[PDB]
Amino acid sequence: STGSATTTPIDSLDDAYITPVQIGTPAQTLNLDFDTGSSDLWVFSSETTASEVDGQTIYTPSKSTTAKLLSGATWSISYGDGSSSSGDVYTDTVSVGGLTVTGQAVESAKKVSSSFTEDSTIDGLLGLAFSTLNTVSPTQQKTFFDNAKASLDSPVFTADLGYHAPGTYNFGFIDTTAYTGSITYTAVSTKQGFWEWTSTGYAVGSGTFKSTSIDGIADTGTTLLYLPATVVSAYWAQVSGAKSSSSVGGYVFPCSATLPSFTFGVGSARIVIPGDYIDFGPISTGSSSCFGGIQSSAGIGINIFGDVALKAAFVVFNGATTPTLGFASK
Fold first, then answer.
1. In what order do the strands lie in the sheet with 279-282?
2. Among residues 39, 85, 199, 261, which one is catalytic?
3. Residue 199 annotated as catalytic
4. Where is the Peptidase A1 domain?
């Protein structure tokens, strides 16, 4: 089997991408944030504290003839950005882009943190990291991809995120029309439960490529590119007037600037992030200070190849017995 679904930016900055997911019978379609950095499929629901729902579409298990309470199971998650959610668990039928899993754990939120409430466009998350990170207790549950894997034509999924435009998540096949050149594959460590890999270096604009190993995770659920402070300083030094602002929370730059590109290495291959992809707009409405899309990972504890990086590539998440990642230009 295969599946294919379009993923759409939630706003004009590509702050996140939402993909429609069918849950239950009859289907209830919720728009979920597909997150290769976590492993829970959780949704706003009829059980979510009412004051914490503000415009989201909710899953109502009592209206699904295939929903079954997973007796005794609870979940609770905290994300790298300080947000969190928790609740109980049902199993139900879940379909993405024509690919159906029966008996998928659907984690129903009883509580969500304020950042989720305040974002009316995201109805939940669909985790695509390794199932070892799933938070359900006392019986850990499998991700959608893990449940689907054995049925797929090939045990892979691909992320093809758009710049200021929709993109595609495919399951079970590699669309050879969706990229240019060849796909370069690179080793993955699953020791932390993430799609963790080692970039071979970077360049700023037209500058020379610096060969250096940069360990990090491929994370579709993180907006920006978070790299070591040395690398990030080298980037912003090429933008007149750019500086790190402690009060804003990162590097800012004059909105009048033209940003240079940023290149990262995948083996001997190179992925080029155009400068425009690094512009996240005014820090507040009407400001002439703009927020940068490349930020320091110091204090986060891991480097993160988030959407800024991934949207410059066609990315293969190869879930074979020994997982690997593939990157192609597009």
1. 243-245, 250-254, 289-292, 279-282
2. 199
3. yes
4. 17-328
- Give the CA-trace dihedral at 65, 149, 165, 200, to 10 degrees: 150
* Catalytic residue list contains 35: yes
Q: Is 48 exposed, middle or buried (0-12, 13-18, 19+ CB in 10 A)?
A: buried
Residue among 51, 192, 183, 31 at smallest CA distance from 96? 31
- Identify whether the C-beta of residue 164 lies closer than 8 Å to the C-beta of residue 9: yes
**Using H for helix, E for strand and C for coil, what is the string for the chain?**
CCEEEEEEECCCCCCCEEEEEEECCCCEEEEEEEECCCCCEEECECCCCHHHCCCCCCECHHHCCCCEEEEEEEEEEECCCCCEEEEEEEEEEEEECCEEEEEEEEEEEEEECHHHHCCCCCCEEEECCCHHHCCCECCCCCCHHHHHHHHCCCCEEEEECCCCCCEEEEECCCCCCCCCCCCEEEECECCCCCCEEEEEEEEECCCCCEEEEEEEEECCCCCCEEECHHHHHHHHCCCCCCEEECCCCEEEEECCCCCCCEEEEECCEEEEECHHHHEEEECCCCCCEEEECEEECCCCCCEEECHHHHCCCEEEEECCCCCEEEEECC
CA distances from 260 to 59, 163, 272, 313 (A): 44, 16, 10, 18
Please provide residue 133's backbone torsions phi and psi, each rounded to the nearest 5 degrees: -90, -5
End-to-end Cα spacing for the chain: 25
> Please, what's the largest Cα pairwise distance for the chain?
60
Resolution in Å, one decimal, please: 1.1
Out of 35, 40, 123, 279, the active site residue is 35
Tell me how far CA of residue 227 lies from CA of 88, 152, 208, 283, 305, in angstroms: 36, 34, 18, 21, 8
In whole angstroms, what is the distance from residue 306 CA to residue 236 CA?
18
Q: What six digits make up the tokens of 159?
A: 């992320």
